[PDB]
């Protein structure tokens, strides 16, 4: 209720105490050389002024200094060479030790574990127990501001430990370090590596799982290499831990709770620094930015989640203001119970780098059930709003989990969520651009603001509906995919699809159809395409493909494959730019193409070298069997306003506007140009007289000499051009006469 950030805030900047009884005890000679000797440091020295006991009420031992838990006693050797070791004392109240040992190696473990406790009086004091070794070494359990027995008796308050060695503070494996509700732990030496279970926050008394349970390991002096390797945050409660580090953190496994809080604090950039009465300046903290080169390592998350079930899911966060969060390849572990864990990977002014793959009780897919919504969350870069969220590890997400990243350019690698479904792909927080390289979705949720998605996936889903891509916000103007490509649904429904809400334009590359899955284009009035527009199944089409859209508008050399097999549906302005369209029967019929309002168009000389023509505008090839003497409706239009870069046309000059299309338009049949036959020499004379069916230019291609910088358009093939229809009717494979008409001749433009 009160939070950390008050809580260390307020306990940082403390008087100690006022004891009264200052015991000093000096090491004189004896100690100071024998340099191996391993002595004890309880027995033979600190056992004269620390007096053991019993408390009337759950005692296992009992300890205190002198008369009471509120004397202080202080250790003064400076000089006293060896070694050094605790072991044993354990439920020490205590109060106001200091073992000032230089040059001393310290051994706070042996055979027994520690405990430094202090009582919950009318005077709420601490303990502030202090060592000054040279290196201290661990080496077995320290259980800082414990529980003394078992509930009864008296309460524990707040506590303070500080470890100031000057060449390392190192730990075994078995060294179970876990401060409870009050304690703190400062550190001063350099190169900090705990190689065991530090447990921030632990069920101080047997039932109350409601406590607040705050710590706090403040590593601020460490001026070397921090190493935690195994560290877990909260037992049965929402405990709110936090470490305020220097600068450079790598640790290892972090294992959170279900409602269990995180705050690494990188420092700052140039570092740290009847009668009234006057109470001392209480200088407090707010949320600040780290420095440059702050950086935190942590290479696996995992959460622990067993227990009730509350209305949400609980929100286990950790909170960084460090320049950088990288997180390595141990990627992300989730425990799921009924309902859906939350976890809140939180960056205040960094950046986010996840390295790992995202899973979900401990595997990549990681079905979850409906009321079962597990939620990912990251935040990169809030209070200073352009921190990026990178993360190069290919993701895959199941069924109901719940990405959102709310950051300034979340780039990415790929996600994959057309395995799963019913997943909220969130990205409503995003500033500008969501890079994506490759994405799977079913039935998702996606809401982005602008992006370039280079790769993108259709897939159906069973045979359900209501289940399908839902673009649910505004798509924006700078919008861009690179390549959509359908996937193939189900027999007789449209089970999956694409829809949208909103947006004006989205610049696609590439497309493919593919039967029963729907390419819902609503309310965009600019989606562009810029190269082949094709089927999922290029060679054999069947079905049906609903591109229900409201507008496109076609850029240069984008091949479109229309036939009866793709229901193009367009309510809305077909425009064509310098795009060579091609048609299929598939039967001898054309199927119509309907223009909603106008399709207006513009060219120029789109001439090729390899014909000598202009490029053929508007192809009908695989019509072989097309029918002949019979009118084939090739699109049902209301305007085809044709242009050039000026009104009048072929090319640059003042011709007029519909009977040139006649001769950009081209039937390519008898794998050759049947509408005309645009010849530049002699060698095409006989593919030419293939296509006609003529032996006059097969057997001898110097029979017709009409055709040298010429060419001829067939009679018996006549076309509409005009403002209100385009239709083609093949009527007749008729042979040309070489000097009596129907001749046309090259562009010539080059």
Known sequence: ?????????????????????VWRIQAGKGFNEFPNKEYDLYKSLLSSKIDGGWDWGNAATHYWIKGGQWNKLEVDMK??????????????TGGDLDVNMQKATLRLGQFNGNSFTSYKDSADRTTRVDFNAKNILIDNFLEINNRVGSGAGRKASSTVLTLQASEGITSSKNAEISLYDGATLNLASNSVKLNGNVWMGRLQYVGAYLAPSYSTINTSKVTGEVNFNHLTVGDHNAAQAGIIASNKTHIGTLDLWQSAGLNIIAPPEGGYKQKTEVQPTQVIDGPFAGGKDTVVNIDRINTKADGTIKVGGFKASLTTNAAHLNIGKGGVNLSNQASGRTLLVENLTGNITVDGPLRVNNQVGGYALAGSSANFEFKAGVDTKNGTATFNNDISLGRFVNLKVDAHTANFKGIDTGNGGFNTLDFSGVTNKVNINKLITASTNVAVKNFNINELIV????????????????????????????????????????????????????????????????NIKNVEITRKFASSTPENPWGTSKLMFNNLTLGQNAVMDYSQFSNLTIQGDFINNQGTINYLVRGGKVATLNVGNAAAMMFNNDIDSATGFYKPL????????????????????????????????????????????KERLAL?????????????????IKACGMAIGNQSMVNNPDNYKYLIGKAWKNIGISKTANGSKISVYYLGNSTPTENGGNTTNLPTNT
């Not at 950390?4 to 009264?20: H, R």
């Not at 000089?79 to 020490?92: E, I, M, P, Q």
């Not at 005309?676 to 002699?682: G, H, P, Q």
Request: glycine letters at 10%; charged letters at 25%; proline letters at 2%.
């Open 1 to 21: 209720l009160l939070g950390w950030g008050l809580k260390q805030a307020e306990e940082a900047n403390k008087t100690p105490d006022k004891p009264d009884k």
């Open 79 to 92: 000089d006293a060479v060896g070694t050094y070791k605790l072991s044993g004392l354990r439920n020490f």
């Open 459 to 522: 897939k159906t889903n069973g045979v359900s509906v209501g289940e399908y891509t839902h673009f649910s916000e505004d798509i924006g103007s700078q919008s861009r995919i690179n390549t959509v490509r359908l996937e193939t649904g189900t027999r007789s429904i449209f089970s999956g699809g694409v829809k949208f809400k909103s947006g004006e334009k989205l610049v696609i590359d590439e497309f493919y159809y593919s039967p029963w899955n729907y390419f819902d284009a609503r």
């Open 618 to 661: 508007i192809k009908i090839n695989s019509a072989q069997d097309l029918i002949k003497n019979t009118e084939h409706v090739l699109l049902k239009a209301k305007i085809i306003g044709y242009g050039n870069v000026s009104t009048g046309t072929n090319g640059i000059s003042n011709v007029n506007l519909e009977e040139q299309f």
């Open 668 to 684: 390519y049949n008898n794998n050759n140009r049947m509408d005309t036959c645009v010849v530049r020499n002699t060698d095409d």
